[PDB]
């Protein structure tokens, strides 16, 4: 239905061990499709999904050019940041960036993003209107004044609504077989006794794509949050995802509990009940 494209970059300084390492990765929804690593031998933006290899030679030259320029920009920004926070040149610092867009089922613009984080904390973010900045602290406030005066957001806006959307649209078509598929979860419930009085019920969801899913426990058809354990959705490594939800229950009361599985690959949500 709705689709996203995101680019995530990480610049990490390592004083005494040469210049900062720069790593950038690109995603369409939950599928990685490109990478660039400043420490790799190739010095090129590399394919990471089969369907991105159908882009011609000029795409790889242009994209390599872009990712290398961002690599240089964020090396400078690491130096500007030290000065703004009055930090020592000897310590290791991190500059992260994310940018990208959201499109509807019609392949039309919904939302745009362009944001930084310094040492794992919000630095500056482009607001939803694509005309203003959310600066988090005093240092980011200096950048905000600089970027607003120079009308920099118009360049972000022209990218996010244009180039970003066109690329996302072209990728969805070229990788249709992969990106526009829905792999519903394969579900099951397991039972694990604790004591003579307690047991754990674990509701599993496996082999699903996209990553978004909701697992809920209910007792007697009433929502249950107490005695619940939910693991983070995790990648299987084959392009699909996994998740589980567990509840600690009194012995003999197992069947009063139900697991509710919500996934866009499902025609209806699934309800699971322990059936020995």
């Amino acid at each position: 239905g709705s689709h996203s494209m995101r680019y995530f970059s990480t610049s990490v300084s390592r004083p005494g061990r040469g210049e900062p390492r720069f790593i950038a990765v690109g995603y369409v929804d939950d599928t990685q499709f490109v990478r660039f690593d400043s420490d790799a031998a190739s010095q090129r933006m590399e394919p990471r999904a089969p369907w991105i290899e159908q882009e011609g030679p000029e795409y790889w030259d242009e994209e390599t050019g872009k990712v290398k320029a961002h690599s240089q920009t964020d090396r400078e920004n690491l130096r500007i940041a030290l000065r703004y926070y009055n930090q020592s040149e000897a310590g290791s610092h991190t500059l992260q960036m994310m940018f990208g867009c959201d499109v509807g089922s019609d392949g039309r613009f919904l939302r745009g993003y362009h944001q930084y984080a310094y040492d794992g904390k919000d630095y500056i973010a482009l607001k939803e209107d694509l005309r203003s900045w959310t600066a988090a602290d005093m240092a980011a406030q200096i950048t905000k004044r600089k970027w607003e005066a120079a009308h920099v957001a118009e360049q972000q806006r022209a990218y996010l609504e244009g180039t970003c959307v066109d690329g996302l649209r072209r990728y969805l078509e070229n990788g249709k077989e992969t990106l526009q598929r829905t792999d519903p979860p394969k579900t099951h419930m397991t039972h694990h006794p604790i004591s003579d009085h307690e047991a754990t019920l674990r509701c599993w969801a496996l082999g699903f794509y996209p990553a978004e899913i909701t697992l809920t426990w209910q007792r007697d058809g009433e929502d249950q949050t107490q005695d619940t354990e939910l693991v983070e959705t995790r990648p299987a490594g084959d392009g699909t995802f996994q998740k589980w939800a567990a509840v600690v229950v009194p012995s003999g009361e197992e069947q009063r509990y139900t697991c509710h599985v919500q996934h866009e690959g499902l025609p209806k949500p699934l309800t699971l009940r322990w059936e020995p």
Partner: peptide, 9 residues
């Protein structure tokens, strides 16, 4: 399609 990231903080 990547963006041109050229502005400084």
């Amino acid at each position: 399609t990547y963006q041109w990231v050229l502005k400084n903080l």
